[PDB]
Amino acid sequence: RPVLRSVNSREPSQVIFCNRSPRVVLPVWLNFDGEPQPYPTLPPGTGRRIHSYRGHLWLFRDAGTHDGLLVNQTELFVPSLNVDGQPIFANITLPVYTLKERCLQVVRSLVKPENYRRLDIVRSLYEDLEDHPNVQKDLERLTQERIAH
Amino acid sequence: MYVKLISSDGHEFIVKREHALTSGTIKAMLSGPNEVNFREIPSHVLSKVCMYFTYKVRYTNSSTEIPEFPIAPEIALELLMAANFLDC
Amino acid sequence: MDVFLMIRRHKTTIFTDAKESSTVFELKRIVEGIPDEQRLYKDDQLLDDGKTLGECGFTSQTARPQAPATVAFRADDTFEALCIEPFSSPPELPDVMKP
Structure with missing residues (x-):
């Protein structure tokens, strides 16, 4: 009921988080209640394809200081759907x-x-x-x- | 157009004006419808502050990977003092 | 793409930038805005005019903005020695701020 929650889109969206920052990156996901959740951390430089959902809400922090990091030149990340089966790309900086x-x-x-x-x-x-x-x-x-x- | 931001020990940093506009202080010191001296800001502290400028112009609004800002632990308690005053 | 520079003479430091393919005579006009009486030096090596920035050893890799690479006035007739006054030194790092 807050205006930053993941839509219950029930649609798969294969997404790639790669961290192009010096930090250890913590993926944070705002759920269906809008309460942020911690996912496995990304070591600096590396990245992984993830199974996320269309219209989910991701943001990224340095796992240490919790410093605000960017993703695709923005604070928040929401994917849409994979056109013709190709995956969405989250560039964490x-x-x-x-x-x-x-x-x-x-x-x-x-x-x-x-x-x-x-x-x-x-x-x-x-x-x-x-x-x-x-x-x-x-x-x-x-x-x-x-x-x- | 250029400014001449002088330090306490007498270092005169001539930088680009738009670069200097990054400071909120230095924006309200050049705002009258050039030169600015700082009495309690050293040289080793101001050259590094003129750096945030060249780099803040460069990297703000950039789609690439964006490099970390280097802070030697020694100039670390004097740049925070500079910046809190500078407002940038 | 380009380099990032600190052009130093005495207690003058200039925060500028130039392209890696562009020459020294170009950078000597850039300074002629802040030629016949002007000598630039990599450390201690007198740079010559028909040379580019990459030829004088400023890769944009060694001239990043958050730590720019560092680039003599002819008064009367002869030149001065390249004179650059170093900055002050910070206090020794506090007792708890150390490891």
């Missing part, structure tokens, strides 16, 4: 982040959770750090994204 979270990501990995507070930084930054990107959030951000459009 890095987005041009802002140098802000780009750097956030780095500080975030090198510094353990508790000791963000030791870093010699201005005060708004401990919150910039402490709010590491989230999928449940990036679902709410996007629903009103498309509700405005």
Whole structure:
């Protein structure tokens, strides 16, 4: 009943996820309730043909930081049907982040959770750090994204 | 058209204006209907910030694979400080 | 396709780009916008004019934008030595930020 769920299309759609990003990629699938689900991770560079369904809803994150990744130059992925039996192609890449979270990501990995507070930084930054990107959030951000459009 | 973004120690980075427009700060410093000096941003921090520009112009709206941004763990606490201020 | 460049002289660094097939005399007009008094150098090697970027050893593989490759003023009559002032050094990395 939210406006980002997989349609119960009951139609097969053989789909290829290959990760062209340095990250370990986590396929996330928004089901029939719109609740994201974790699938087996893709090592960087490689990819697999998957049995998905027409009009299912896939998005992709770095399995580590949960950083937002792109797919076919977009946040979300929905296939359609395989024309003449040929398969759909999901090209998972890095987005041009802002140098802000780009750097956030780095500080975030090198510094353990508790000791963000030791870093010699201005005060708004401990919150910039402490709010590491989230999928449940990036679902709410996007629903009103498309509700405005 | 070009700008001259100078650092604290006195490094003068002449970059493309549209590249500089990537900053939200530097967009509201050139907005009056050139040069900008930064007093608390070093050179080793600003050259790397002029890099996000050449690369943000290059790779935003690109259908290819898009390369990772390189951050040496040492310039890592000073670019976050630069960027949070820069707004890019 | 093309290279990515940092053209350095003293405390001047210029963020530009040029095609790998295009020459040096072209890059010396590009600088004549920011010729008779101008010498470019790969590291310590004086580049000559009728040579291209690929001929001077800037593959677009060694001149990516997120780390561009680095490319002398003739005052009066003679040239200066190629002078480039390095950037400052960051503080040593904090006690917890280290492994």
